[PDB]
């Protein structure tokens with residue numbers, strides 16, 4: 118569990134930022150290059166505040182599977198000259214399951230806070246706030262608003278991005294390797 | 299840093315609770331027996347909500363040093379029949395300094411969240427929100443309200459209780475062994 122936190126803390130320090138869109142404040146993970154990722158419901162506009170700085174969003178892909186079903190992630194390419202440490206190698210090919218995960222959040226409400234959400238099982242199908250959604254990971258932890266974009270980790274693994282919950286369970290969209298090249 | 303988090307998580311699970319008084323919501327650490335501890339400014343009343351349950355407070359000691367100077371901790375004895383796992387052995391005789399600390403918080407705003415506040419140095423004297431105060435530990439972390447009563451830890455050590463900050467530094471009252479027998 119320590120090693121997971123240890124990984125979590127170096128990962129967030131190296132690849133995360135706090136983002137403001139018009140839909141709220143979110144944690145954001147840079148994946149490679151100038152591409153990062155947000156929960157879909159961050160509905161990012163044509164520009165964003167990234168660590169308190171205006172950044173224009175070159176592109177954005179609201180992800181759905183073949184049958185078109187909601188996956189709940191948006192990817193965005195950012196005109197900044199800086200390139201994110203490529204972490205694609207940490208992203209799995211299919212939904213991961215771990216016994217001890219850490220959820221990492223980096224915003225104004227929760228600056229650099231980590232939550233031992235313990236055990237994460239592929240939940241799969243979920244009707245999320247009315248929306249048919251798939252590829253969800255589920256963890257037993259009493260999650261809260263302001264936590265979206267939160268990064269779900271174990272040692273060695275970026276498992277996905279936090280997108281919802283209700284009182285005593287939370288849910289991440291699984292962050293799969295092939296969403297980027 | 300992992301081992302610190304690992305210690306933090308077992309400690310909070312075993313000895314912490316979420317407390318409501320009329321002054322707000324706080325993290326509370328049970329020390330031994332029926333004695334726990336709150337930041338002074340929790341100003342606890344004759345009864346408290348401990349994990350959503352009314353508990354009457356048998357006694358309360360607002361701690362000051364010899365010269366009478368503010369220490370900013372209140373200790374309280376609780377009529378519950380349950381006895382806290384005695385953790386007095388984890389409390390140092392003088393102000394600790396560590397290179398890697400974790401701050402643990404357990405309330406409604408922050409349920410079971412941990413913050414790697416890194417390096418903690420005895421700050422000593424501080425005029426805290428107008429109040430002359432001593433025995434403060436200082437950490438460089440952008441702390442927030444709702445974090446008071448937060449427990450400051452490294453591996454093996456309960457260092458003290460979170461009591462304030464301003465933007466980019468936070469401060470705990472050092473939690474010393476002799477405050478209890």
Ligand SMILES: *[C@@H](CC(=O)OCC)[C@H](C[C@@H]1CCNC1=O)NC(=O)[C@H](Cc1ccccc1)NC(=O)OCc1ccccc1
Pocket residue numbers: 140141142143158244245246247248260261262263264265266280281282283284286287288
């Ligand atoms: C994250 C929102 C956020 O970060 O705010 C920015 C300022 C929030 C996390 C969630 C809130 C309470 N506990 C949590 O873990 N996300 C949601 O609330 C999420 C929002 C959403 C997204 C897509 C579509 C609809 C709504 N929804 C959510 O948690 O719904 C609860 C739920 C769970 C299972 C079945 C149905 C509904």
Ligand SMILES: *[C@@H](CC(=O)OCC)[C@H](C[C@@H]1CCNC1=O)NC(=O)[C@H](Cc1ccccc1)NC(=O)OCc1ccccc1
Pocket residue numbers: 321322323324339425426427428429441442443444445446447461462463464465467468469
């Ligand atoms: C904790 C309050 C809390 O948990 O609320 C319950 C619902 C809060 C933490 C603090 C707030 C912003 N960042 C932080 O880390 N504590 C205080 O705000 C603390 C309150 C207090 C206590 C005793 C006397 C006066 C005030 N005060 C504080 O942080 O003051 C800032 C400061 C720092 C250095 C010098 C002077 C003033």
